[PDB]
């Protein structure tokens, strides 16, 4: 009859599910990721995805920017999880005083490129021959969103 999708800050009970999801795409993780700001997408009563944010560097001059990372579960594909997370982060950023969101995406990653551009991100960088992968060099883009 109905479905519900909730996005909220990560809670203690989430970590078993998060640790599990991060493997698909124990307490060391739980320690590591409490230095980290994570928001969680809950579909019904299951973890469907997360968005994680942190300033791109430790520089004070960088503290008004969030580098972002999205993870969507293999069991919650194609239900707008990615977009709901982006929308929520843009709203959180506005109140947090964050001026700018960014991330990097591999040139060959057409789906991510289209996703972020669809969500109003613009290309700021084309890093050519940027990453060495098994004998070849791969290009990378940086995308930005202005709150």
Q: How many Cβ atoms sit within 10 Å of the Cβ of residue 109?
A: 14
Which of Mg ion, a copy of itself, none lies near 87, with the C-beta cut-off 5 to 8 A by kind?
Answer: Mg ion
Q: Which residues pair with 132 in a beta bridge?
A: 137
Least distance in angstroms from the C-beta of 91 to Mg ion: 6
Name the segment binding Mg ion (CB under 5 A); options: 20-28, 66-74, 86-94, 104-112. Answer: 86-94
Among 6, 46, 57, 87, binds Mg ion (CB under 5 A): 87
Q: How far, CA to CA in Å, does 81 sit from each of 15, 29, 87?
A: 19, 23, 10
Has 87 been labeled as part of a binding site?
A: yes
110 binds Mg ion (CB under 5 A): no
Name the segment binding a copy of itself (CB under 8 A); options: 14-22, 40-48, 76-84, 129-137. Answer: 129-137
**For the chain, what is the largest distance between any 2 Cα atoms, rounded to a whole number of angstroms?**
53
90 binds a copy of itself (CB under 8 A): no
13 binds a copy of itself (CB under 8 A): no
Q: How many Cβ atoms sit within 10 Å of the Cβ of residue 97?
A: 9
Least distance in angstroms from the C-beta of 90 to Mg ion: 6
Distance CA 11, CA 49 (A): 13
Q: Between residues 3 and 134, which has the closer beta carbon with respect to a copy of itself?
A: 134
Q: How far, CA to CA in Å, does 101 sit from each of 22, 25, 39, 147?
A: 22, 22, 15, 8
Please report, in range form, the residues annotated as the binding site. Answer: 87
Please report, in range form, the residues annotated as the binding site for Mg(2+). Answer: 87
């Amino acid at each position: 009859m109905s479905t519900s999708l909730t996005i909220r800050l990560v809670a203690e009970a989430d970590w078993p599910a998060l640790h599990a999801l991060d493997q698909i795409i124990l307490a060391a993780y739980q320690e590591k990721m409490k230095d980290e700001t994570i928001f969680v997408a809950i579909s019904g009563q299951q973890l469907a995805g997360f968005i994680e944010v942190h300033p791109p560097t430790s520089l004070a001059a960088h503290q008004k920017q969030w580098l972002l990372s999205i993870g969507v579960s293999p069991d919650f594909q194609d239900q707008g999880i990615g977009g709901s997370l982006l929308s929520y982060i843009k709203d959180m950023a506005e109140i947090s005083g964050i001026h700018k969101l960014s991330l990097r995406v591999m040139a060959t990653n057409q789906e991510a490129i289209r996703f972020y551009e669809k969500h109003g991100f613009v290309q700021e960088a084309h890093f050519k021959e940027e990453f060495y992968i098994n004998g070849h060099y791969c290009d990378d883009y940086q995308y930005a969103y202005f709150i």
